[PDB]
Amino acid sequence: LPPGWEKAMSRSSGRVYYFNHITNASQWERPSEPARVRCSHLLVKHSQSRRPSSWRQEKITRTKEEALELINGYIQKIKSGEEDFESLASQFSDCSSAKARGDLGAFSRGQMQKPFEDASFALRTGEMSGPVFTDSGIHIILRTE
Ligand SMILES: O=C(O)c1cc(-c2ccccn2)n[nH]1
């Protein structure tokens, strides 16, 4: 199985599923290197975030446990087609790239912080990540090219 795609056991149904320990993606169907990849993301900062500040709120106060909740929340809406990445990203993302529907433009290694990189490279064109933790906050990372 591709980079970090491991199989495992669903603790609700006991039926097969896959999680990726590099992007924290989890999906039921079996899964499927670039020099550069292009990604958009939705960032939800927290108190412990690098710069607890964003175009949305001058001092972020939400805890980490809560940041995650919010992040899980959008994943459900994205996964269920209730909302798309771009809409939630253009509204909620605590990064200024929200103005650009969360695009961060094309990029290669060394360039971004490592957990974001490792996720960004391990996704394939189309995959969204699960929650990804960096010193900045919590990300949902979609890979576009
Ligand atoms: O604070 C911000 O504005 C911010 C930081 C990031 C970021 C992007 C990639 C990896 C790590 N952090 N994205 N947005």
> For the CA atoms of the chain, what is the radius of gyration?
15
Q: Tally Cβ neighbours within 10 Å of residue 79.
A: 12
- Cα separation, 25 vs 52, whole angstroms: 26
Question: Domain check: are 24 and 48 in the same one?
Answer: no
Buried b or exposed e, range 132-145, using 16+ CB within 10 angstroms: bbbebbbbbbbbbe
Q: Which of 38, 95, 142 to probe ligand 1 with, by most ligand atoms within 8 A of CB?
A: 95
CB–CB of 109/121 below 8 Å? yes
Q: Does ligand 1 have an atom closer than 6 angstroms to the CB of 116? A: yes
Domain count, the chain: 2
Question: Domain check: are 64 and 107 in the same one?
Answer: yes
70 phi/psi in degrees, rounded to 5 = -60, -40
Which protein residue has the closest C-alpha to ligand 1 atom 12? 136
Q: Is 131 helix (H, G, I), strand (E, B) or coil?
A: coil
Reading the block at residue 82, the tokens are 């209730």
- Cα separation, 12 vs 76, whole angstroms: 17
64 phi/psi in degrees, rounded to 5 = -75, -45
Reported as type and span, the H/E element at residue 107 is strand 103-108
Question: Domain check: are 14 and 84 in the same one?
Answer: no
Question: Ligand 1 atom closest to Cα of 134?
Answer: 11
Q: Is 92 helix (H, G, I), strand (E, B) or coil?
A: helix
Question: Domain check: are 72 and 100 in the same one?
Answer: yes
Question: Domain check: are 48 and 103 in the same one?
Answer: yes
CB–CB of 42/130 below 8 Å? no
Q: Which one-letter DSSP state was computed for residue 80?
A: T
Which residues, other chains included, contact 62 with Cβ-Cβ below 8 Å and sequence gap of 6+?
44, 45, 46, 47, 70
Range of the domain at 57: 36-145
Question: Domain check: are 104 and 42 in the same one?
Answer: yes
Sign of the alpha-carbon torsion through 64, 66, 67, 71: positive
Resolution of this deposited model, Å: 2.3
Question: Domain check: are 48 and 100 in the same one?
Answer: yes
| DSSP letter for each residue of 7-54 | EEE-TTT--EEEEETTT--EESS-----SEEEEEEEEE--TTSSS--B
- Cα separation, 54 vs 60, whole angstroms: 8
Does the active-site annotation cover 90?
no
C-beta pairs of 76-83 under 8 Å, 24+ apart in sequence: 78/128, 78/140
Domain holding 11: CATH number? 2.20.70.10
Question: Domain check: are 86 and 126 in the same one?
Answer: yes
Question: Domain check: are 76 and 45 in the same one?
Answer: yes
Question: Domain check: are 50 and 9 in the same one?
Answer: no
Reading the block at residue 50, the tokens are 């690098």
- Cα separation, 21 vs 19, whole angstroms: 6
Question: Domain check: are 61 and 15 in the same one?
Answer: no
Domain holding 82: CATH number? 3.10.50.40
Question: Domain check: are 52 and 95 in the same one?
Answer: yes
Q: Does ligand 1 have an atom closer than 6 angstroms to the CB of 114? A: no
